Design a protein around this ligand. Sequence first.
Ligand code: HEM
Ligand SMILES: [N]
Length: 184
Amino acid sequence: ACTKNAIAQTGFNKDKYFNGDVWYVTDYLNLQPDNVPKRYCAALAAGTASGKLKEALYHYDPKTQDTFYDVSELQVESLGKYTANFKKVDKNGNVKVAVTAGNYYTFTVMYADDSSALIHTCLHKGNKDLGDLYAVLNRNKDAAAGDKVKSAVSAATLEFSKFISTKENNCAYDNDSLKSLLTK
Ligand code: HEM
Ligand SMILES: [N]
């Protein structure tokens, strides 16, 4: 179930978030914890291409080896709040599963600055969803969450101590593939 209307950041700077670069997930929290694994690697690139907001996603489960990339076109609901389609692709952008009606995620940027962000997303696949997921992002894959993003976590009535870190997984990313997916 999707249960939260996530509040976008006051003064959100869209151009700085959607600048073409990679954001690494450093910490995450699902409100239905059994919906996601306890060990995981994820990253995204976010930018504008051909006049549209785009994200490219990467997921990797280091226990099962499941690996997948996605390309998304984001439509604007309001500043910092988006509805994204998705197509599953290989690292080279070859579509494995096309954009499909009712395959979408919502995406809200709750906080962002030059180095860090806090987002909310709820994923829909037909009549099922994967629950409310929060993620702390950083421009540096290893970086400890700083005071400002932690203040944003608390101001959303969340406890940072409940987030799961991706650090122990020593994740590695294909940054060229991921960023280049923005034009796919
Ligand atoms: C550590 C962070 C994350 C974890 C642990 C996580 C976990 C998952 C898992 C377990 C699935 C497969 C669900 C299923 O097959 O039912 C999935 C798929 C997906 N995730 Fe997440 N995810 C994370 C971050 C994100 C972020 C930030 C976004 C969007 C910006 C996102 C968007 C999606 C989409 C669109 C799919 C479906 C992919 C497809 O079928 O093509 N994920 N992720
Ligand atoms: N997700």
